[PDB]
Amino acid sequence: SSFSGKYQLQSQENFEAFMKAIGLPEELIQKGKDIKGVSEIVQNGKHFKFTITAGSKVIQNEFTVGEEAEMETMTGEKVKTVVQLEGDNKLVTTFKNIKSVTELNGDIITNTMTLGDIVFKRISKRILE
Amino acid sequence: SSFSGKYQLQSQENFEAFMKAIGLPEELIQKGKDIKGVSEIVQNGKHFKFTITAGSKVIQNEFTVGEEAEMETMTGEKVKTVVQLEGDNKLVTTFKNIKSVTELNGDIITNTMTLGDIVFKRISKRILE
Numbered sequence: 254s255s256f257s258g259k260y261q262l263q264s265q266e267n268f269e270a271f272m273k274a275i276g277l278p279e280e281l282i283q284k285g286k287d288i289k290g291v292s293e294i295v296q297n298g299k300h301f302k303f304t305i306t307a308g309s310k311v312i313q314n315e316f317t318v319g320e321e322a323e324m325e326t327m328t329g330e331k332v333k334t335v336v337q338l339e340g341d342n343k344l345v346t347t348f349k350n351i352k353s354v355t356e357l358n359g360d361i362i363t364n365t366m367t368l369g370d371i372v373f374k375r376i377s378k379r380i381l382e
Numbered sequence: 383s384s385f386s387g388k389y390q391l392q393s394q395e396n397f398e399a400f401m402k403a404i405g406l407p408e409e410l411i412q413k414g415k416d417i418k419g420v421s422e423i424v425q426n427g428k429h430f431k432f433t434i435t436a437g438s439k440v441i442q443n444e445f446t447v448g449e450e451a452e453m454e455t456m457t458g459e460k461v462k463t464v465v466q467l468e469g470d471n472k473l474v475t476t477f478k479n480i481k482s483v484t485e486l487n488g489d490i491i492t493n494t495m496t497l498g499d500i501v502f503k504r505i506s507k508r509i510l511e
């Protein structure tokens with residue numbers, strides 16, 4: 254129903270391979286790979302505000318599902334894409350050659366980002382306030 | 383008693399003035415000045431692990447109070463300093479020309495950094511888990 258909340262990263266798979274493939278500087282990969290930070294989502298209907306801790310960067314994006322949005326990626330590049338709702342608990346988007354699926358299951362969020370043969374997967378858990 | 387917790391930034395003063403004074407690019411200042419993120423402290427006796435959300439950057443430092451440690455600053459520079467514990471609720475250190483005081487009262491942390499005539503103050507509140 255609602256994605257809103259604060260989520261702490263629990264585990265992730267293939268961070269280094271994915272970050273190398275998108276061209277992140279090696280120095281930012283090494284300092285960011287072991288950080289387990291907190292991301293915050295604010296949902297108002299179809300409108301989303303994301304404050305994402307990804308490695309050693311904080312990225313803030315907003316968008317409305319189904320509307321074209323301009324989004325900052327991990328490299329700082331801005332991309333124009335549309336985020337779709339699949340079901341009621343999955344956000345799905347494509348940009349460049351990446352497919353991103355954000356799936357909510359109770360207190361667990363799983364983000365899966367596929368780039369060619371690399372699947373970068375983040376599992377986070379809702380902070381219970 | 384214990385600093386351990388996740389702390390969400392509530393308010394801050396002189397973020398822009400401090401970041402300009404230490405040489406951060408205006409681009410990074412504008413990106414980060416409105417972010418109200420979560421920082422995490424883990425205390426075990428004299429040992430502290432910090433995961434700090436500072437603007438658009440996440441910085442992860444670790445130190446034992448009273449021992450010289452290398453700490454990453456906002457500029458990416460690693461400084462060697464000693465942090466001391468004053469009482470049970472104040473962390474005090476000085477590096478370059480900055481004095482930093484981190485004070486815990488109840489569930490509120492007040493961080494005050496003084497650089498010349500600029501007092502950079504951050505007020506953050508413990509997330510009640």
Ligand SMILES: CCCCCCCCCCCCCCCC(=O)O
Pocket residue numbers: 260262291292305306307312324325326327353355362364375376377
């Ligand atoms: C679509 C690009 C957004 C920014 C790219 C950063 C790479 C990681 C994105 C994961 C954010 C998904 C939100 C769930 C919480 C989390 O995993 O932090």
Ligand SMILES: CCCCCCCCCCCCCCCC(=O)O
Pocket residue numbers: 389391420421434435436441443453454455456482484491493504505506
């Ligand atoms: C002294 C090394 C750290 C350098 C980073 C400076 C940016 C502000 C640091 C304040 C963190 C203090 C912990 C309380 C929580 C917070 O304010 O995020």
